[PDB]
Design a binder for this molecule. Structure first.
Ligand SMILES: O=C(O)C(F)(F)C(F)(F)C(F)(F)C(F)(F)C(F)(F)C(F)(F)F
Ligand SMILES: O=C(O)C(F)(F)C(F)(F)C(F)(F)C(F)(F)C(F)(F)C(F)(F)F
Length: 133
């Protein structure tokens, strides 16, 4: 199921991330740092539990979850959300809900690259990761 997503991934392309951050209300000085950061994402499984780490020179996050089971999450920008991650069409779909708002973080594999599509409001950001050995 999820096994092609597992491993260490490095950011190699980003489109419309400023739009996405601004839609979420991230302040301009933070957006400026974030626009120049290249995170590493590490996706590990242990049985039915996935752990997704995001590491950078600015902020780090880590979440653990079972597919299809809601979990509490506090995002990098300090939103307290109700989250669920599911496999849908071969994509890892992460849905966050708070205050009646929603955002999706969708990961899919295309030609061995991991494409992360972030949608909030009308903003749609595409971030591409390449696998580390
Ligand atoms: O993993 C990535 O590339 C990523 F930086 F885009 C990201 F998903 F972490 C993210 F979008 F920045 C995020 F941290 F999750 C965020 F949505 F919470 C926000 F910070 F942008 F507000
Ligand atoms: O700090 C915010 O609000 C932020 F959105 F800018 C941010 F830290 F989440 C980030 F820089 F966008 C981020 F990209 F998610 C990150 F730094 F966490 C990382 F993913 F780069 F690691």
């Amino acid at each position: 199921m999820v096994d092609a997503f597992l491993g260490t991934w490095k950011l190699v392309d980003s489109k419309n991330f400023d739009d996405y951050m601004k839609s979420l209300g991230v302040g301009f000085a933070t957006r400026q740092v974030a626009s120049m950061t290249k995170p590493t994402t590490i996706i590990e499984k242990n049985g039915d539990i996935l752990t997704l780490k995001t590491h950078s020179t600015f902020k780090n996050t880590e979440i653990s979850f079972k597919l299809g089971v809601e979990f509490d999450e506090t995002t990098a920008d300090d939103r307290k959300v109700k989250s669920i991650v599911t496999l849908d069409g071969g994509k890892l779909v992460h849905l966050q809900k708070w205050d009646g708002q929603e955002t999706t973080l969708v990961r899919e594999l295309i030609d061995g690259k991991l494409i992360l599509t972030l949608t909030h409001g009308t903003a749609v950001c595409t971030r591409t990761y390449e696998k580390e050995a």
